[PDB]
Design a binder for this molecule. Structure first.
Ligand code: HEC
Ligand code: HEC
Lengths: 108, 108
């Protein structure tokens, strides 16, 4: 594909307003409705310890990158049918760019 | 009209990313390409001291409120023909809501 960096401040607010409801992102933050996402780009789907994932996400075995991430957030279920993440998606690239910007920084 | 409160954190990033280029908002911040906007909702257009406004904005005599503001940011020049603010506008209400949210808080 093609992915460009947007704004990490903007990505920050999007997170707080769209993801934080179900996820933490900090090193050592708790699993909640969703799994903790710290360190995600160095991992594959369904590997956070103690988190109960659907068969769907485990089997998908997604190696998370800025590119897999942009497609996933477009529409989570289209990408991972069976997934229990209840989020419609981020339709705008601009939106996904900003957010993945932040994630990439914050997840490391 | 009708104006609803969105997010002040989101409004914050929008500012930094869309307005800050030309405006400061803090009490005692400097005039720049644009006038300082601290205290704007208690004022009419073209009254900041030392700022050189166009005849256009002065004559318009806009009493700035969440409602005049939402329409202005839709398209500044459509609202104030002759105005020298070079910004296309914020097409989404959602976007304007967030931003006016922040402004209202930050401008006081
Ligand atoms: C609650 C309503 C959620 C919101 C809002 C978001 N996510 Fe989510 N996420 C949620 C669940 C229940 C799950 C588990 C899915 C399963 O089938 O097990 C997830 C999963 C993810 C993942 C997968 C990571 C992995 O370890 O495989 C990612 C990358 C993820 N969520 C990211 C994410 C972002 C960035 C969000 C905000 C736009 C977001 N999710 C929203 C629950 C919820
Ligand atoms: C520089 C490219 C600008 C950006 C980006 C934004 N504004 Fe602006 N603004 C700018 C100028 C040059 C002017 C003066 C217009 C004139 O004709 O004199 C303005 C003016 C305003 C006003 C009017 C306030 C007054 O005292 O009458 C407001 C409320 C305002 N600007 C707000 C504002 C916001 C919220 C912005 C971000 C989306 C924004 N402007 C962008 C220059 C520039």
């Amino acid at each position: 594909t093609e992915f460009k960096a947007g704004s990490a401040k903007k990505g920050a607010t999007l997170f707080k307003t769209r993801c934080q409801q179900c996820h933490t992102i900090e090193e050592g933050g708790p699993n909640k409705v969703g799994p903790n996402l710290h360190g995600i780009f160095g991992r594959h789907s369904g590997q956070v310890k103690g988190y109960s994932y659907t068969d769907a996400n485990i089997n998908k075995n997604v190696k998370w990158d800025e590119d897999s991430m942009s497609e996933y957030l477009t529409n989570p279920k289209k990408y991972i049918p069976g997934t229990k993440m209840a989020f419609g998606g981020l339709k705008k690239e601009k939106d996904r760019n900003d957010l993945i910007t932040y994630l990439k920084k914050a997840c490391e």
